[PDB]
Amino acid sequence: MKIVLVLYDAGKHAADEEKLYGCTENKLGIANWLKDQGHELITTSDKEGGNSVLDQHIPDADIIITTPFHPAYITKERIDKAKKLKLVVVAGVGSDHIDLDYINQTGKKISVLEVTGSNVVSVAEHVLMTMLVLVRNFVPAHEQIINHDWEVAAIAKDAYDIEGKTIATIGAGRIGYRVLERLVPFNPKELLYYDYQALPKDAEEKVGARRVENIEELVAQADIVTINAPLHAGTKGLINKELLSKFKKGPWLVNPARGAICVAEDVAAALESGQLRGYGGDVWFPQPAPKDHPWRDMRNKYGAGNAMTPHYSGTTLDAQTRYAEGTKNILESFFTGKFDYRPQDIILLNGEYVT
Amino acid sequence: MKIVLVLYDAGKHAADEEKLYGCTENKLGIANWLKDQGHELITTSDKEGGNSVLDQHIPDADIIITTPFHPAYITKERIDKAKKLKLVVVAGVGSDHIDLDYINQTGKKISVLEVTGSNVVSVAEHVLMTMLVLVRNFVPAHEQIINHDWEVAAIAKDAYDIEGKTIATIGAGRIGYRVLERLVPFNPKELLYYDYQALPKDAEEKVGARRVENIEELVAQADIVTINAPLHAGTKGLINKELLSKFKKGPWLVNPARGAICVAEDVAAALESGQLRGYGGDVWFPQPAPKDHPWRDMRNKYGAGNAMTPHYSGTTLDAQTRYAEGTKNILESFFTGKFDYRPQDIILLNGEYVT
Amino acid sequence: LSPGELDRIKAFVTSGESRLRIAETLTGSRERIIKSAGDALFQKRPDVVSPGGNAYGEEMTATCLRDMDYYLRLITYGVVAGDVTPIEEIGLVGVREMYKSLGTPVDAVAQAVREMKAVATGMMSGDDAAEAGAYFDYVIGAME
Amino acid sequence: SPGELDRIKAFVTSGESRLRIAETLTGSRERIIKSAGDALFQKRPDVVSPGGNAYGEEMTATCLRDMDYYLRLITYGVVAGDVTPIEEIGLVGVREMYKSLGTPVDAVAQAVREMKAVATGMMSGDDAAEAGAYFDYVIGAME
Ligand SMILES: *[C@H](C)[C@H]1/C(=C/c2[nH]c(/C=C3N=C(/C=C4\NC(=O)C(CC)=C4C)C(C)=C\3CCC(=O)O)c(CCC(=O)O)c2C)NC(=O)[C@@H]1C
Ligand SMILES: *[C@H](C)[C@H]1/C(=C/c2[nH]c(/C=C3N=C(/C=C4\NC(=O)C(CC)=C4C)C(C)=C\3CCC(=O)O)c(CCC(=O)O)c2C)NC(=O)[C@@H]1C
């Protein structure tokens, strides 16, 4: 019962706010419980390089706990050297940093669990926020006031209502369906989706959505496109110069899924030429973004159309409380030997997929 | 047959965008139509001072057309000098700049019309956008990227979801009711309203809203407050230091109604002390905002919590097209002598109210 | 801070005492003025009755007498100061379409201020009653 | 990179087996897919009504399209140094991707085995050994 968990260092910000659970200083709010229970807890942010605290303790550890906002990469190299490992937890949602194929093909006896559901509302709200900010031209308008200007015609000339627009999502899982739900009362012209599997007929009708089976047919009729899909072959590098030339002229694109689904230099060129009128979201490749990444400085012809943020949509204080509670629930199912996990939380039960 | 309309000068922006109808260069898209009939059209932005183009032609004009984004103040003095005036049109919604009481009590035979409905969706979308930007802490997040930084903990420590919050509107007319409709699928804890008149019971139940009959009881239970009310006695200066001290600690306030409903220096002090966590909106007093107006530089303790813009929510290109069509419809009802106005558009019909 | 304002204030301090005597009566007898005037109002406008009755409640009747107190305190402020400008800017700006949206008959609010004028000036000298009467009239004129 | 420059110069200056393999894969690529598809569907009659992930005329044509993708990708690998471009473009999350589509992964492996047999049969004994290693790299990721 040795436990290693890696989180980022929040510095002075950790003392300002006690509900900032997912950091090295505050330890997901479970440190006192683990110590009372007789377990040993190593907490560190030092995860890169062969001389790292993480590597120093992995040959020993029984449990490793990770976060997608500072991921420890659980490589086969590290997996072979981890002789006592029985359980990997994601305090959040997202497991691209773990070699699930290796574990499953080798048949190792390692369970892998995440707190599924805990991030979906927060991301969906961030999509709605970014669409309104781009379509209504908010960023240059707030800039005028901070800078002590006032010139309405310069803002109004590229501002629209979202009412009456056609809106499409690439991906209709938990996050994309919740985006569609929140858009219904804004009176769009139509809602559309593309996905490798159909939504059930009852779910389609609740939001008035129509399935489009061809990706190029989908984007060619949309004023607004949002990406809510996983990263694999056939989605990696999907948003390139060729597909971008099928978009309507002057629409808006939002991506809070994975940065590598886009070709970074190609969307920047589309924004400068006017093929796109704006781009926004919070995911990058590489991540964290280098200081010279092209998405930092790109603009449209009027000097706006950029609504990027760092990667934080799933880390609001309401979301942090949910996976503090979810991590302790998972750990206790293990400690007790009940193994009464929530079915939706299991992504690998002793190196095996379920159902 | 002689018409004066006053709009702002848009300068070079007018040539960039044909649908920017409400400006001096583009003339609401109805020049040519007016010239093809037998009418003379004066267009000017020069409305202040007794030496003005507006005053130059008031003694003679048959019709005056105004906009709430650059209003010509139709004072009793000007009304006395306007020997031939028979019709005042607002190309938009909002008639505070016209002395309706003087026209009505004196019994002058001047009718007054606006294009009602044309602005309400645009303003309601701007309220939803501002609530999300403040609650989720967007402004300092975008600033980190523009400035070539990356520090997630400094953003996350004051970012929340809108799900599960209690939200109240002061005023439940056309705009406030459309705000409530768009909030329903975001799963708030409860929706509340205050108004001098009750909503019908079927309308209350469609959005799950509860009437609160006392203004201090309303704000004391709300996490988010939005103002959607007209300006008069007992609304003027309503948001002052005493009422602000009844708000919950650390909530958010949004105002796209009228600036003078707030005491400007009192809300700035509340934001600095932490009584308010953020303030946003697009309306000011005085307006346009002086370069030293306190709402430009005010921030909360973390340097954020400010989402002000200049006054533009009702001036998107979609709203401007509606204004242009509605103005020509009103003018034609007058020119033909049918006077078949839409009932909702009438505020004064020959100097008196209708019912 | 304007020279005309300073002049109006210095007059209250240094010259005539009629503004001082008027304010003594309005503050000292304020509760009797409202109670006596409300009785007279409801005898002249029995629309404290079931139907319309904008003031039909025991609760709504108390809200009406609250508004009467507002205007008496605002007229008191005007007497102490130079002038009627604060009465205009605080009590009369949106009034009328405000009361219209409440269902309150505007000419009945004017009549309430007439009834306060009669009780108050009845307690004053002949000269003080003429000076005080002009401030009441300024409110009545905006509502009738 | 010097190691990459070296593998390119070898194609230009030294051995000609990579050139010969590429000549065959481009020159009869349509015959390789048509012949291998026939053999696949005889060994896995799951062009049948039930599951049949490839049941339609339309879904059968999508299957043969994917076979064309892997043949063009293996051709690129032969021309270049190595198998790195094969891994990063054709194998990323391929097991989870096909699983979400309903298509059995071990049947995709069998399709690449069938393309290996036809293509290799048109080559010299030595060229067929060299080409065969590239086909095997794909087969191993799906079986
Ligand atoms: C009594 C003479 C009449 C009467 C009065 C009445 N008023 C209301 C409600 C309101 N009155 C006001 C007035 C003001 N508030 C201010 O701050 C100022 C400036 C000093 C004024 C003049 C307001 C704002 C309201 C509404 C908000 C509130 O109550 O705070 C009512 C209640 C009406 C209802 O149906 O809810 C009544 C009854 N009514 C009569 O019929 C009398 C003639
Ligand atoms: C034929 C051997 C088998 C078969 C194939 C089959 N595939 C699909 C759908 C897709 N195939 C891919 C594959 C790729 N796209 C890429 O860009 C790359 C990288 C080079 C690869 C490997 C993708 C992305 C899809 C989905 C999206 C698209 O079609 O563009 C289908 C259709 C399945 C359906 O039900 O819709 C089929 C039938 N199926 C079999 O049964 C054979 C064993």
Side-chain angles (χ1 to χ4, degrees), chain A residues 13 16 136 142 148 308, chain B residues 142 151 157 291 308 312:
Chain A
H13 304 296
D16 290 352
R136 302 191 62 76
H142 181 65
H148 295 244
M308 304 299 302
Chain B
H142 181 62
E151 198 182 352
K157 78 178 166 174
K291 323 78 199 163
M308 300 301 302
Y312 86 102

Side-chain angles (χ1 to χ4, degrees), chain B residues 194 196 233-234, chain C residues 41-42 47 54-55 60 63-68 70-71 90-91 95 98-99 102 104-105 108-109 112:
Chain B
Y194 172 95
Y196 296 170
Chain C
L41 168 71
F42 299 140
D47 312 329
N54 189 252
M60 296 291 95
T63 298
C64 178
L65 295 184
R66 173 207 73 172
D67 284 18
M68 294 178 62
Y70 285 172
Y71 279 108
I90 278 161
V95 98
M98 184 195 79
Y99 274 124
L102 285 157
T104 315
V109 184

